[PDB]
Amino acid sequence: VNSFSGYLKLTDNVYIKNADIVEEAKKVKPTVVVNAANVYLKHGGGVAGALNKATNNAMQVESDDYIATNGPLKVGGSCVLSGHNLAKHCLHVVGPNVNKGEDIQLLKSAYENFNQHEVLLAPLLSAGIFGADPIHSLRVCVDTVRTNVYLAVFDKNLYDKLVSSFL
Ligand SMILES: CC[C@@H](CNc1ncnc2[nH]cnc12)NC(=O)CCC1CCCCC1
């Protein structure tokens, strides 16, 4: 038993809620919150800009030191950093950005990072400003992630859609 509330159960291991991941994060203090990162860890907008703002820019300061030491992530890759005031850890995961021409096949590789963590609070990778179809993203999530994932879909119209079309 864990502390997530109000989720709809999609499969054995995937759950979905209409929620603001920042607010869900501040209430659950999950062990892991997933950020929809880019390779430079420049958290300017979307989920990343919201998570970072909620940390009063501490996420960005930590991220800039990470990049200065290690260089950029790979598309499809990830790193574990602090969760600051939102979670124990933040798993920064880079899904492909269709608005940058990146290969959508890398979305499966991105979701594979979730399997290194038993339970995660996460957004749909490559959704929103990353330009992928959130329904395809949900299908890849369900078919790739084997650990327990709690998906927060900020928008209500899209949520209800994702549920109604789910196979
Ligand atoms: C689907 C991916 C999410 C990712 N963003 C966040 N997800 C969770 N919590 C957040 N807090 C701040 N941002 C988020 N994007 C949206 O819902 C934007 C609206 C839809 C409307 C339909 C077409 C695609 C864009």
Which domains does the chain carry?
8-165 (3.40.220.10)
Ligand 1 — pocket residues by CB below 6 A?
20-22, 46-47, 50, 123-124, 127-128, 134, 152-155, 158
For residues 44 and 32, give the distance between their C-alpha atoms in angstroms, rounded to a whole number: 21
> CA nearest 79: which of 91, 97, 62?
91
For residues 129 and 95, give the distance between their C-alpha atoms in angstroms, rounded to a whole number: 11
| Cited resolution, angstroms | 1.0
For residues 73 and 71, give the distance between their C-alpha atoms in angstroms, rounded to a whole number: 7
Provide the total of helices (H) and of strands (E) in the chain, helices listed first.
6, 7
Nearest CA to ligand 1 atom 6: 47
Nearest CA to ligand 1 atom 25: 128
- What the block records as the tokens of 131 is 């330009």
CB crowding 5-16: b at 16 or more within 10 Å, else e: eebeebeeebbb
Sort strands 14-17 and 8-9 into parallel, antiparallel or unpaired. Answer: antiparallel
> CA nearest 107: which of 72, 81, 80, 145?
145
- C-alpha distances out from residue 119 to 13, 38, 148, Å: 9, 22, 5
For residues 133 and 118, give the distance between their C-alpha atoms in angstroms, rounded to a whole number: 26
> CA nearest 3: which of 34, 22, 25?
25
Asked if residue 130 lies in contact with residue 159, where contact means CB atoms within 8 angstroms, the answer is: no
Asked if residue 120 lies in contact with residue 150, where contact means CB atoms within 8 angstroms, the answer is: yes
Q: How was this structure determined?
A: X-ray
